[PDB]
Amino acid sequence: KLQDSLDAGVGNLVDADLAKESAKLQSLQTKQQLGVQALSIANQSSSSILSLF
Amino acid sequence: KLQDSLDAGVGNLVDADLAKESAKLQSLQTKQQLGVQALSIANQSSSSILSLF
């Protein structure tokens, strides 16, 4: 009985909640996809200078 | 006569009542059958996490 209590206590200390990690993973994947597109938008600046010359 | 008295006395000391043991046995068998089912119910927890990923 004591060993079961100690195992449960350590698990309570260091375990995670995967239900929350799923939501965080979804939001972060969407944000990374948006960040790549934002970097692509930022790269195409200064390309309009060539028309002046 | 004395030997009969002593045998009856020892029997009175260490004998059981089987009428009560029958009822206790029935209740304990039912409780064990319920305990196996309860353990089976407890095992199937955390199986719903996989749907989140």
GROMACS .gro file of C-alpha atoms in nm:
model
  106
    1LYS     CA    1   0.000   0.000   0.000
    2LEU     CA    2   0.281   0.243   0.088
    3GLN     CA    3   0.464   0.179  -0.239
    4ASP     CA    4   0.144   0.252  -0.431
    5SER     CA    5   0.107   0.581  -0.241
    6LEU     CA    6   0.464   0.687  -0.319
    7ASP     CA    7   0.431   0.603  -0.689
    8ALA     CA    8   0.108   0.803  -0.710
    9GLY     CA    9   0.276   1.096  -0.536
   10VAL     CA   10   0.570   1.108  -0.776
   11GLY     CA   11   0.332   1.081  -1.070
   12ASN     CA   12   0.134   1.372  -0.929
   13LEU     CA   13   0.461   1.567  -0.910
   14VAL     CA   14   0.596   1.522  -1.261
   15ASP     CA   15   0.305   1.424  -1.489
   16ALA     CA   16   0.150   1.638  -1.762
   17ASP     CA   17  -0.204   1.703  -1.885
   18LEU     CA   18  -0.220   1.596  -2.249
   19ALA     CA   19  -0.563   1.752  -2.307
   20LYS     CA   20  -0.405   2.096  -2.270
   21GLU     CA   21  -0.099   2.004  -2.475
   22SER     CA   22  -0.322   1.912  -2.770
   23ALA     CA   23  -0.477   2.260  -2.778
   24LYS     CA   24  -0.140   2.429  -2.736
   25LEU     CA   25   0.006   2.216  -3.017
   26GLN     CA   26  -0.276   2.311  -3.254
   27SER     CA   27  -0.237   2.682  -3.184
   28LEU     CA   28   0.142   2.669  -3.219
   29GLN     CA   29   0.127   2.480  -3.549
   30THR     CA   30  -0.111   2.741  -3.690
   31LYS     CA   31   0.112   3.022  -3.564
   32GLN     CA   32   0.421   2.867  -3.726
   33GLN     CA   33   0.240   2.832  -4.058
   34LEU     CA   34   0.144   3.199  -4.033
   35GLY     CA   35   0.500   3.297  -3.942
   36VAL     CA   36   0.647   3.135  -4.252
   37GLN     CA   37   0.399   3.327  -4.467
   38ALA     CA   38   0.479   3.651  -4.283
   39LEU     CA   39   0.850   3.601  -4.349
   40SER     CA   40   0.770   3.537  -4.715
   41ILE     CA   41   0.576   3.865  -4.726
   42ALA     CA   42   0.864   4.051  -4.562
   43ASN     CA   43   1.120   3.916  -4.810
   44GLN     CA   44   0.944   4.056  -5.118
   45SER     CA   45   1.001   4.415  -5.003
   46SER     CA   46   1.244   4.641  -5.195
   47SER     CA   47   1.177   4.449  -5.518
   48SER     CA   48   0.994   4.752  -5.661
   49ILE     CA   49   1.309   4.967  -5.677
   50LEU     CA   50   1.415   4.819  -6.011
   51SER     CA   51   1.121   4.981  -6.192
   52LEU     CA   52   1.258   5.326  -6.108
   53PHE     CA   53   1.578   5.264  -6.306
   54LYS     CA   54  -1.917  -3.971   3.120
   55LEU     CA   55  -1.626  -3.738   3.202
   56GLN     CA   56  -1.457  -3.801   2.867
   57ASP     CA   57  -1.782  -3.714   2.689
   58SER     CA   58  -1.801  -3.389   2.887
   59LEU     CA   59  -1.444  -3.292   2.797
   60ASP     CA   60  -1.493  -3.367   2.427
   61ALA     CA   61  -1.810  -3.157   2.423
   62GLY     CA   62  -1.627  -2.873   2.596
   63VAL     CA   63  -1.342  -2.865   2.345
   64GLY     CA   64  -1.591  -2.878   2.060
   65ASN     CA   65  -1.774  -2.584   2.214
   66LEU     CA   66  -1.442  -2.400   2.224
   67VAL     CA   67  -1.321  -2.442   1.868
   68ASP     CA   68  -1.623  -2.526   1.649
   69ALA     CA   69  -1.781  -2.302   1.387
   70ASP     CA   70  -2.138  -2.223   1.278
   71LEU     CA   71  -2.171  -2.322   0.913
   72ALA     CA   72  -2.510  -2.154   0.871
   73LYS     CA   73  -2.340  -1.816   0.909
   74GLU     CA   74  -2.045  -1.914   0.690
   75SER     CA   75  -2.282  -1.992   0.402
   76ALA     CA   76  -2.426  -1.640   0.407
   77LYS     CA   77  -2.082  -1.482   0.439
   78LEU     CA   78  -1.954  -1.694   0.149
   79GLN     CA   79  -2.241  -1.585  -0.076
   80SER     CA   80  -2.188  -1.217   0.000
   81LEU     CA   81  -1.811  -1.241  -0.050
   82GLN     CA   82  -1.844  -1.422  -0.382
   83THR     CA   83  -2.079  -1.152  -0.509
   84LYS     CA   84  -1.842  -0.880  -0.385
   85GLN     CA   85  -1.545  -1.041  -0.562
   86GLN     CA   86  -1.740  -1.064  -0.887
   87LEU     CA   87  -1.822  -0.695  -0.852
   88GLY     CA   88  -1.460  -0.610  -0.773
   89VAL     CA   89  -1.330  -0.769  -1.091
   90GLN     CA   90  -1.580  -0.565  -1.293
   91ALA     CA   91  -1.483  -0.247  -1.106
   92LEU     CA   92  -1.116  -0.308  -1.186
   93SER     CA   93  -1.211  -0.362  -1.550
   94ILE     CA   94  -1.396  -0.028  -1.548
   95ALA     CA   95  -1.096   0.146  -1.391
   96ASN     CA   96  -0.854   0.008  -1.652
   97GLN     CA   97  -1.036   0.160  -1.950
   98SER     CA   98  -0.964   0.514  -1.830
   99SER     CA   99  -0.722   0.737  -2.026
  100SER     CA  100  -0.807   0.553  -2.351
  101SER     CA  101  -0.985   0.865  -2.480
  102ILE     CA  102  -0.664   1.070  -2.504
  103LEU     CA  103  -0.575   0.927  -2.845
  104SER     CA  104  -0.871   1.101  -3.011
  105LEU     CA  105  -0.719   1.440  -2.925
  106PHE     CA  106  -0.409   1.372  -3.137
   0.00000   0.00000   0.00000
